[PDB]
Amino acid sequence: ITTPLVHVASVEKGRSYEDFQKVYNAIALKLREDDEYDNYIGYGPVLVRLAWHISGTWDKHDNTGGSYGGTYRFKKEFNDPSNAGLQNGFKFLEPIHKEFPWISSGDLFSLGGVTAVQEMQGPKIPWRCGRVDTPEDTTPDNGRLPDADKDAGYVRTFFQRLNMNDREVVALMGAHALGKTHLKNSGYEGPWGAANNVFTNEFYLNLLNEDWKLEKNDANNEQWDSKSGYMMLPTDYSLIQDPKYLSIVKEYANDQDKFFKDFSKAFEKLLENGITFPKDAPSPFIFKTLEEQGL
Numbered sequence: 001i002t003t004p005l006v007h008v009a010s011v012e013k014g015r016s017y018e019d020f021q022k023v024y025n026a027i028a029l030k031l032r033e034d035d036e037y038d039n040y041i042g043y044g045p046v047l048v049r050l051a052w053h054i055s056g057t058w059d060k061h062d063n064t065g066g067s068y069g070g071t072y073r074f075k076k077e078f079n080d081p082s083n084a085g086l087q088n089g090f091k092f093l094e095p096i097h098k099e100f101p102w103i104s105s106g107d108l109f110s111l112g113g114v115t116a117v118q119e120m121q122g123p124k125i126p127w128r129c130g131r132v133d134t135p136e137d138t139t140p141d142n143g144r145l146p147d148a149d150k151d152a153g154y155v156r157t158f159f160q161r162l163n164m165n166d167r168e169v170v171a172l173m174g175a176h177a178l179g180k181t182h183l184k185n186s187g188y189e190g191p192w193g194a195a196n197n198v199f200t201n202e203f204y205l206n207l208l209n210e211d212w213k214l215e216k217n218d219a220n221n222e223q224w225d226s227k228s229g230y231m232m233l234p235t236d237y238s239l240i241q242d243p244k245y246l247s248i249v250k251e252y253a254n255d256q257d258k259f260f261k262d263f264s265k266a267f268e269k270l271l272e273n274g275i276t277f278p279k280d281a282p283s284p285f286i287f288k289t290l291e292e293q294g295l
C-alpha cells in the first residue's frame, strides 16, 4: 500500500509562452514599482523565499508536498511558523493573480521567484507550466521546512529528502545574498551581505573573507556575526565547517558564472520536484527580462 503519487502537469487551457510572459512582466513591472518594501530592499528576496518554501515541503519517499498543488493558499501551510513573513510575498502576487485568473497558484508562486531572480540581475531560470491546484486535504503538515540552528550533517540529510546533492545544496544556499533575516519572523536579525537586492555570489565571498564570531541575538538564538554588520545562520556557517561543502563554497566565490549555472539548474529542479511532465508537454520557457524587452 501507499505508493508514490503521480502529479501530471497540465498546461492551462489555450495558454502558451506569450501568455506566461505577460504574467512575468506584470510581476516584474510591479517589482520596480513597489520599491519601498522592507527599507527599500524590494519584494525581490521575499518572492524567491516564497518559491523555495512552497517547494521545500516535498518528500521524495511518498511524493507528498511540493509546488504542484499550490497548497500555500490554505491556512495550514499559510500559517506554518516556518513561513513567517512570506505573507508579504503572497499579498504582492494577489493583484497579479486577479489580472491573470487562468494561471494556477503553484505556477504563480514559482514564477514569482523565477521573475525576482532574473529581474535582480540573476541567471536565466527555465520554467515549466502545468501545476494544478489540489484540494485543502492535500496540504502538507507543518515541520517539513528546515531549521536554521543546525549543522552540516542536518543540512545534508534534510536536502537528501529533496533529492539534492552537495553541489546543488551549496548553489541553492547562495540565494541568501538576497534580503535579510527579521527577528519577528525567524528569531534571527541581520543581512548576509551588502547588496540585498542584487543576485551575486556575495554569500560565498563573505563566508570566507569576514571574521565571524558566534554571538547571541535578542531572541536568545546564536548566530554568526561579523564586524561589517553581516550575519550567518548556523546552517550557513556549516557550509565552511564541512570540508566537502567548503570546496564548493570556495569554488562559487572564485567564479560567479559557475554559481549562476548551478543555481539555475538546482532552482528549477527544486521548483519541479514531484511533477511528472508528459511526452507532449511544452519545453521549458526562458522569459525575457524587462530590460531585454525595452519595457
Ligand code: HEM
Binding pocket: 045, 046, 048, 049, 052, 084, 085, 146, 147, 148, 149, 155, 172, 173, 175, 176, 178, 179, 180, 181, 182, 183, 185, 186, 187, 188, 233, 235, 267
Ligand atoms: C538549510 C537551508 C535553509 C535555511 C535553514 C534557511 C533559513 C532562512 C531563514 C531563517 C530566513 C529568515 C527569514 C526571515 O526572518 O524573514 C531565510 C531567509 C531567506 N531565505 Fe533561506 N534558508 C535555507 C535555504 C534557502 C534556499 C534554498 C533559498 C532559495 C532557493 C533561500 C532563500 C531565502 C531568501 C531570499 C531569504 C530572504 C527573505 C527576505 O529577505 O524576506 N533560503 N532563510
